[PDB]
Each structure stands twice: as C-alpha cells, then as structure tokens.
Amino acid sequence: PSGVEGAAFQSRLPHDRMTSQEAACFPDIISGPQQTQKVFLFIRNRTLQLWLDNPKIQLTFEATLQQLEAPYNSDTVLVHRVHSYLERHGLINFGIYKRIKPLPTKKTGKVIIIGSGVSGLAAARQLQSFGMDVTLLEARDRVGGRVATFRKGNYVADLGAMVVTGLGGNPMAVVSKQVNMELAKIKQKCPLYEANGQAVPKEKDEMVEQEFNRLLEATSYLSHQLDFNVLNNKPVSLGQALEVVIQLQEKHVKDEQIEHWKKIVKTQEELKELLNKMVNLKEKIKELHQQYKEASEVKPPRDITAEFLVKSKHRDLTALCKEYDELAETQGKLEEKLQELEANPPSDVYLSSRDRQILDWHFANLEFANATPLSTLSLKHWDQDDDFEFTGSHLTVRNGYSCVPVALAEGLDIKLNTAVRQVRYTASGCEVIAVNTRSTSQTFIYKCDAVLCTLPLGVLKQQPPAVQFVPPLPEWKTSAVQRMGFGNLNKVVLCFDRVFWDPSVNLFGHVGSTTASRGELFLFWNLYKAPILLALVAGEAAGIMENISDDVIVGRCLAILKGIFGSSAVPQPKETVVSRWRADPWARGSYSYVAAGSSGNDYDLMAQPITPGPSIPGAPQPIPRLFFAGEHTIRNYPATVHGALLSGLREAGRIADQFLGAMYTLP
Template sequence: MNPTQTSTPQIITETICLSDDSDMEMSEDKTPKNSSKPEERRSSRRKRIKVVEEKSESVPKSVEKKPNIDKSITTKKKEPSPATSTSQKPDETKPQENRDPFKEILTGLEGAAFQSRLPCEKMTASEAACFPEITKNGLISTRVFLNIRNRILQMWIEDPKTQLTLENTMKRMEKPFECDPDLVKKIHSFLERHGYINFGIFKRLKPLPTLKHGKVVVIGAGISGLIAARQLQSFGFDVTVLEARDRVGGRIASFRKNNYVADLGAMVVTGVWGNPITTLSRQIGIEMLPIKSMCPLYGAGGKLVKKEKDEMIEREFNRLLESTSYLSHTLDINYCGNYPLSLGDALEFLIKMQEKHVKEKQAQYLQDITQHQEKLLAGQEQIMTKVQKLKEIKANYAKLQNSSKKQPSKQADTETANAEIEWQRRSTLREWKLIWNEIEAIKEENTELENKLKDLENNPPSDIYLSSKDRQILDWHFANLEFANATPLNNLSLKHWDQDDDFEFIGSHTTVKNGYSCLPIALTEGLDIRVNTAVKKIKYYPHGAQVVTENLKTNDQSVTYKADLVLCTLTLGVLKVAISDTTEQINSVRFDPPLPDWKQAAIQRLGFGNLNKVILCFDRIFWDPNVNLFGHVGSTTQSRGELFLFWNISQSPVLLALVAGHSAAIMENVSDDVIVGRCIAVLKGIFGNSAVPQPKETVVTRWRADPWARGSYSFVSVGASGSDYDLLAAPVTPKFDNKGNPVNDMPRLFFAGEHTIRNYPATVHGALLSGLREAGRICDYYLGFPNTYPNEPKS
C-alpha cells in the first residue's frame, strides 16, 4: 500500500510550531486513544540512553516475608476470583541516584514470583506442559502448585548465595504443603532445571555429580556460554568451553589501567525488578550504581540547549514515534509497493507530511485573509450603494413634503391627495429604515471581519515545521534511538522494531562500579575453559558432534574436540559470516553439514548492529560531576550519531563518548588520533579551550571489525520479525547419517546468545536467560523432563 494514498491520522497532520522564536507551547495533543501520552517516554529500549524515570505501573505490591498461605485451600471454601495486584511506587522522597537498587526488590511470595519473571497466580505454558495432572485436577490443585512454587522461589530469592537443596526446601516448607513431598520434589526439579533457582555463583551444599551423562562443547565464553556451562556441569554433564579470545566475557569487556575503569561493551543493567543480573550481583557482591536521569544537551556550537526547547522537541519525537505505530498497527501501512517500510522511512515520511501540512496551513491562511478582505471590500461597496440609495430616498421624501403643501381645488380631491401623499411618505420612511438597518448590519459584519483580519495578521502560522536547529535536536533523539538499536533507523522494521517492549524490566538502571567484566570472570570458577582457541568447523551428525579448532597463541595444528552435542553461542555477526563464506577464511566458522535453510534464512533476515565508544581518561574532572550524561547535538543528519552522548559513570575522571548510526561504521575506518582529536574539539566547544586537558589514556572500539563479534548486538531489521529470534534459538537435528540415510535422532546443535531470545534481545540479561534456557532444553532432551527425572543425578 502506498502511504500517500491513505488518510492520515490527526496526530500526523497536527501542526506544531517549533521555530526558534516560538512561545514554547505545543499544539493540542491528538495522540491516538490507544497510545501513551507523548510526554511519557515509552517503555522501550530507548531507556538505555537518556535514562527514564522509574515506572512501577506493573509492579506488584510488596507483601510480608511470612509465607502467604491461601486459607481457602485448607478450609475447602469456594475459591474467589484472584484480585489484581495493586501498584506500589518506590520511595519518591529520595533522589533516584541515592537509592540502593536492591532495596527495590520485592519480597514475599508475590515478589518472589515477580522477581523470577513468573505470574504469581497463574501457571505458565511450560509449567502446564510439565504438570498436566495439576491443570487437569482443577483450581485447588493449581493453587497448591502455585503456593509451593512461589514459596520455593521465595526461599531462593532470600538467600541466592547458598544452594537450595530439596532437603532444605522440605524442612522450610510450611503446612500443609510438606505433606506432598513428591509434588514439592517435582516443582523443585522443574525450577532448578529451568534456571529459576540454583543458578549463578553460590555455595554448593552437595558436590557435583561424578557420573557424567555426556560430553558438551560450549562455543564462546560470553555470558550465555558461561552460565549454560555452569548449569550443565551441575546437571552432570562433562563441559568444555572454547573461546577464541584471550579473555572471557565476549562483548562484556572492561578497560582497566591504573585507577581508570570503563566498559568497552555492555555497560548498563536495564532495570532490577525481574532481572537475573540482580541475583548474580548479590551473589558476588557487585556494587551497582544507579544512573541519574538528567541529560543536558549542548548544541553544535557548544551552547546549552534550553530545557523547554529540549523537552518540547522530545515530545514531538515521541509523537512521531507514536504516529509510526499508528501507521503500522492501526492503519496497517507497512509496505510501499512490494517493499517493507523501515522505521526511518516512516519517520521521514511523517516529517514531510508535517512540512506539507505547514505549507497547507500557510496557503489556507493567505486564502482566509484574501477572502476576508474581499468580503470587507464588498461590504464597503454595498454601504456606499445603500448610502446613495438613502440620498435618493431623502430627495423623494422632500418632494413629498413639498407636494403636500399644495392644496387641490376640491375638498374631495384634497382628502384623496393627502391620503396618497401620506401613504407614499410612510412607504418612503419604511424603505429608509430598512436600508438603514441593512447598512448597520453590514457595518457589524465589517467590524467582525476587521477583527478577524487583525487576529489573523497578529497570529500568522509558522512558515516551517522545524527550524535547522530544531531538526538538529530532533536528530539527536534519532541518534539516541539508533544507539538503542545499534543501527541507522532505515534498517529497522517499522512493524517489529520494538516487539520486545512489553518485557522491559523496571526499576533503577545501574552500572557496575568496577566494570561489568567482573561478572563473567566470576562465572568462570570451576569451568574447563580453553582460551585462544578459535573454532574453525562444527561437525554434527546423528550420534555426536566434533569441533575443529586452532590455537591462536601457539599456532599449533588443529585440535578436534569430540562431544555428544554442541552449544553454539557465536554472535549473530559471526554466524552471518559463517553462512556467507563458501571457502575457509581466517576467523570464519563452517558448519558441516551446512545449517538448514530455515536457520540460514533467519540469520540473514535478523539484523546485527554496530555501536562504538571512545574512552577518554583525564587527570582531573572538568565537567559537572553530578551529571551522569550530557549530549552533544550534531550539525547534520548524517553525522547525528557522532559523539552524540557522553557518559560520566566512573569514580575516576573518565568520559565515555558514544558513536551510533552511520557514524559508527564510518569511524571504524578513521585513525584513533583523528577520533580522539574530534572528541577533544567537541569538549572544548562545550567547556572552553582552557578547561579541557589532553587525555592521559584513550581507547577507541571497533566492534564491527572485531572478528569474534562482527558487531554489537541484534535488532529487528526490515523484513524480519520477532519470530526470527525463535528460529535462531531452535536446535538443529541431523537429518542424514554419514552414508546419506535419513535419521530421526535428537538435536546435536544448540544455540544461545542475545540474538536467540525473543523477549530480551540485545541485552546481557537476555544472553544469560538464553544460556539458562538452553541448559534446561539440553537436559530435557538427554535426561528427560524434570517431573519424571530425579532431582539429583546419581553419582
């Protein structure tokens, strides 16, 4: 459908004057009824950049730590309908930056379920599949299941530093639920299998199983590979982790030198409620620092953008985004001809529509003035005509008066003549009065027209939709969005780019005080990890798998690792190179046999973006230490992502500049000296030449050029959808044996990583959850479902 052929919603055509001399007042809000207010930032991945104020609309009310046992179960009363949980906002009396993020964690059964991303009063689909007898037996059985499940979750949330064994669970389980040990055992096994309890770094009360169920090779020592390896090891598998780099963490990398600390990759923990990173941080004692939301903007010339101007254009930015959603989801405009539309296409189309609407209002304004002037002139001409008519009536009236003085010769004639003259005189007076009233009415109309003309002349419409400076500020917000998605807006699917918004965690956004890399380093404890080991080929067949590697440090001949199955956590960027290469190249991976067509198609459709950082370490702080973020507005649309945002989140004098959008790709071909020089020039434009010293240390990232990353994180590209994440997550089962005979065996190749989790893509917690998911999936395939498999593997 051609968007120009459809009716445009009122929000799109509503004119908003944003020129420099505007009175800072937006026009009437015409947001569609099903959208949020434009003043409110949407719950989307934009929150990674200009951090939003906390929202708690969906946060359950905190309950007491004492188990909340449902009395209706023990008394056999009729079960009432579950009441909707009320919201409880965090304490607003404390500044956001001073809050302890862990104090926001909810307690009680309801809080434990919420923190575990599970509904408190409802079974999930996976739970219903594993416990069909519970759903079959009705509401009372479901209530019993939920109380046991939530109580076990509560035990784990209260003390995630110690293994929650089945024995301790039974000891702490309250009446009457301890009377059904089999159900408690099954629920405990289910929660442990799927990574809801006993995950991360904790004190084990039971040793690891000595009898191994099989050999697993995990490719990649990022957060997903490490957490999956730990889980599989605890379930009784022999696990080896292969990592091409000389370090663990993947795209979690921290720069440390002297007192300087900065994250080169993942940096922000986006929300604490429901986030598994919260549990890990409590386990290893990571200090989390909440991010202050204030973000002043500095124009291209270094001048501070007025807060009113920034907020006004940000509202317009959100209105434009809401309009794209209206176009896509309400009007179903997602194609132009046979080509799917991108978010960038839709935004530019809406901007052009607004500009067109401004011109239309200008034309209407001139037309209104012309019409009013023509009506005023016509009224004046009518008055002149009627005044002339009054003069004629006056003359006729004078003649009648004179004729009445002449006396006829006969009495009868006199009476007749007088009557006729009186009739003519009265008729003339009536005509006079009628015309006079018409003149007065025209005068009133003319007065009204003059007032309207004066009002029009005093309130001319804007001659532009956005001034050049306004467009620069709007482009900053676009760059902000390009950072959130690691790609130019023209690459994002109009319909599906924000498909994960409903699963955004809430609560404080935080950073890790000593660098994010301390988390993956902690996860390495007890694991067999082979660093400097690059995977060259992944072979999988009906009865096992082989991984051919090369040692990058010693350049030894290839080493082959045999396994029952392989868990591949290679980045989407590396997978894209793998399926595009037909011959062996350095730093590329081959699959043998090639991945199935459906898997390759999903890899090709889904996007893998790029975001780069510039780390600047100084000997002193010359910026406002109370501000975590400040923005730099670019001078052109093409360069809007160049050094558009600076972060001050370190305890030492370190600034971190972001490069997003088209600029992220351009800077990879520019030398460090040029990039750092540009940074210093921008900072001097803001703070003054004398205030900005030369940095002591600098680091420039180039994630696209990194052979083990090939980019930063995934996004839903044009032509892709959220279902492609599911396809990337799906395991691969060999279809033929070595002789080409068809087989029907179990999967041998599994996939994890942020690009494989539909609800939490492009995040560290998403990668972690994908590792937990795959560990559970592997166990389900090779050990059986947890409700039929004993809690502890036999040793």
C-alpha cells in the first residue's frame, strides 16, 4: 500500500486491524466500540508514518501530538499510550537516531546480553535507549557475529549474511536510511554450465526449471491434500517427498509405455487373426477355381445341372473373392494403426542424466537457501515463513554488511574476548561467568537483574555444552533446541587481479556430476563492479568440504572456472578466504531450519523467557530472569538479519515491560 496505510505495511502490520499485542496492551479499545478502534489505528499508522518519513531522529510524543490533526489530536492520553507502545516495542525510535529527549542520568536495572550479534546489539541499544544499564559479552574479537565481512586492501566480501531480501516491510530499510549502507540490486539472470563447461541450452534450462517447480508443487499436494506427513513412525522430509514424487513419475512413464506396446500387440493379434482368415480363404478360392475350371470342361450345350454347376461355382468364387477384398482392405488399415503407433511412442524415460543433474542444481539452490540437505527439512513446515516475504528486489551491501553491527555498537558497553561459560539465574537475580578467550583461566563474573541469551542455536545444541545453565533449562526448552535444525552453508572468496567474466551478470551456476556433490561449488557471485568472485558450498557438500584444505578448494574453484572461461583467461587469485561455519565454535553452523519433526511452534518455545523457582520455599513467584533472542527465536522471520534484529527489539520491549513496568497498558 501507501499513505498511512503504507507505514503499517512497512512496519509489518495490518493497517485496518489491531494485532494480538495491541489487544493485550489496549483491551479497553479492542473490546470497545469499532469507531474507537479506527481512531486507535489511525493514530498508530500516523505515528508510524512520522517515524518512517524521518527515522534519523527521535520522534517524541510531543512532535507526534503536534502533527496529528483533530478529532485524533483530541484524546491525548490515547496518543500517549500509543506512542509509548510503539517506542517500547521497537516500531519507532529504533536503530541509530539523534536523541531529542536526553538520557535519564540515573539508570535503572542491569542486563547482561550474551552475544554481540545483530539481535544482541539491537536489544542493547534499545534497553540503553530506555534507561537500563547494559553490558554485552562477546566471545569473538569483533562485533557482528554471523554478519562477518572480509577486508584486505580494497577487497571486501561478506562470509556471513550478504543479502538484504528486499526493502518492503523490512526494518533494514530504516537501518539503511540511518547508516550509510550503499545498497546494490542483484541481477537475477543465472546461466548454468554442466560438468564440462558447456552452457546448458535454453531449451533444457526451462524444461528442468519448470519440472523442479512442478515437483515442488507436487510435494505440497502430497503434504496438504494427501496428508503424507508421517511415514512409518517418523516424519517425512521434503527430500523423501521429492523422491516419492519422482519415483511415481518414473512409474507413470513405464505404465504409459506398457499400455502403448499393449495397443501394439492387441493390434498385431487382430492382423494375425485376419491374415489367418485370409489364408484359408485363398485356399477355398483356389479349390473353387479348380472346380469351376473342371465343371467348365463339360461343353455346351449341356444339361441344366451342368449349367447350374458352372454358374453356381462361379458365383461362390466371386462371393469369396469379394469377401477377401474386404478382409485385405481391413488389412491395410490395421497396418496403418501400426505405423502410426510405432511412430508415436510415449516418452522414453522420465529424466535423462543431463536432466537429473541439472535438476540436482535446482535442489542444491534450495539446499542453499535452507542451508541444509533437503532430507532434513520438514515436509509440512519448511516453508512456514514464506507468507512473510518482503517486496522489492534482493540487494547487497557494497561496503560490507559489517557496517551495520558496527554502527549499532556505537555507544555501547562491549566486552570482547569474553566467552560466557555459565549462566546462573535465581529468584534474587543472576550471575554470568565468563573467561578471556586468549588467557582462558582469567575469570569474570557479572551480576544482573536479567540475562538476554542470543547464543546461536548451534552453540545451544553443542554436546558437550559450551554453556551451562544453572539451573538447567527445562525439558520444554531443551526439546525445542533438540528438534529445531541448525544447518550450514559456506563461501569461497576469490580475489582477482582482473575481471574475467560477464560483468553484465552477477551470478552463474555449475552443474555437479553427482547428486552427492550437487552443493559443491554449485554457484558463483560477482560483487557489483568489483574484481571478486564468491563460490558457494551448499547441502551435504558444506559439511564435508569443511574438512578439506583451502588450496584443494581453491583448486576445484579455479578448475571449474577454467572449464567455463578457458585455461588462458583464469589468473591465480591475489587473496582467498574459505568460510567454515560449522567449525566456528561461536556459531556451530549458519542458521536455523524447520527440521522434520519440528514446526514453527518451536521458534516460539525458543523465545519464551525462563522464570526460576523461589530461593526461600513458599515465597512467591519470581518474575522471569532469562530471556532469549536471535534468529532462531523469531518464527515469522527466521534465519535472517532482519529477524535477528526484530528478535532483539522484541526482547528489549519484554524486559523493559518487566523491569520498568508498562504504564501505557492502563485505561
């Protein structure tokens, strides 16, 4: 949409309905009369609009009231409650703005945030926004986490997140207005190139793309219409479902061939029955002709029984000659049905080998985006967040995506080289115990009212534990951690002397010889107007590749490229880097996925805070102490930078509601 209605959409909200959060903060309104609902919505959409029109500076309650026009201007408590909800929950005055109102000189509450990723950073900066006192502990020697930019001389290449997945509804839009990110549209033309280096031809490229597409629609059909989601005792993968679909296409190709060849026999059997009738009929003809020849030896004039005999045989023989001409008309027909059927066979096989390999690349591309083997994805649920797509074109960050965390870290208390080891949460508050990464027996202790954990799902899954929780996390949380998936995906950065490839084109594919190696350097990206190529390792390839040397990997890279641009055109590279995200012990993979066995309901479980039992027995229920953020905690926007950011915003709101109170929820 646009106007005020656009501001809603651009804040991922429905312009014409109150959300669940709104209901819960504004029960008086939503259970109210519908006209007050419209008013609420207006004020909301309007304040959103003001923030969006200019997000480089704080939008204050006064500025807001100033720019509302009555009757909306009238109810100033409403306008206050609304402005406060939005601020708290991160829909306005998020990111990097100039402050108008000055910071409370005295702070309230203390929060320790584990991890200086985007989720972490975003929460920090909100909580400090709100007067809490915040410290981040970060295991690495740098801020952005899985936003991780490579930099050497003027070479610049992301090993982490690289792509903004479109600005329409994406809070990163706000962030690019605030930081200088130099965004860059990505040309979606993607050329494929089989093992040898021959461009796939436009005929096949399209046959197979369409078939890929049909095969997915097919799994969906299999899933929803046929309920094919449990098989034996276990849940079905997207991969299994794809096998099955393909096996049934192979079956129907055979079934077709059978019924066609059965049409040929049944036709041949008819021709045989007819050629039999015809051979017997020529016999009776032969006999009658002799008989006539003989009876005709009796010369005229002759008695009438002799005349009868000549005339009668003559008749009989022409009757049968006629009958045989009919049967040999039929014969010429039956022989036509057969040149027709032998010329019009059904198709020979379902997919050729060149076809099935090219299709494997489409599967690699998907393994790439889900950062996991298709055999691990939930059939029902792998795509559960696809409704939440933004709009506009995918972009990249010409100056390196790191520019964002780095910006967000201004002003913030960060401890680098500080690995959290244990997290203690009790009714009275919490203690976090960390160490120095360098000298790993130097020991630190932070006491706080609340911990925000943004440790990666990879790290939470690590056996044995990188981080101990005291007391241990309840079964409800640990089982969700066990069930969610945490995949993997790697990059190879090739830094070049001179651009040697079509610069008109950002990307191009390499088709893999086996299915087993569909992910292996299956795709190449060129950074906009810059002499660098990246090569991607996806699916089952990612894991295996980690455990193979860099020079080998760069080997295979140069090869594939020589095969495409020819041995003369492909230099040794100046610099190379190879990601290994699963080995990275502060990450232990790339990002979450909805493993078969899980649902998006697990993302919600992952986000629920923990509330320790009471220290003294029969003292009352504490307040919650241990909060969670990060990409693996946001059901509608997993595995992205925008969703990490949103998760932090969220938690910051949750924590502030809990520790500063939420005045704005009162009639």
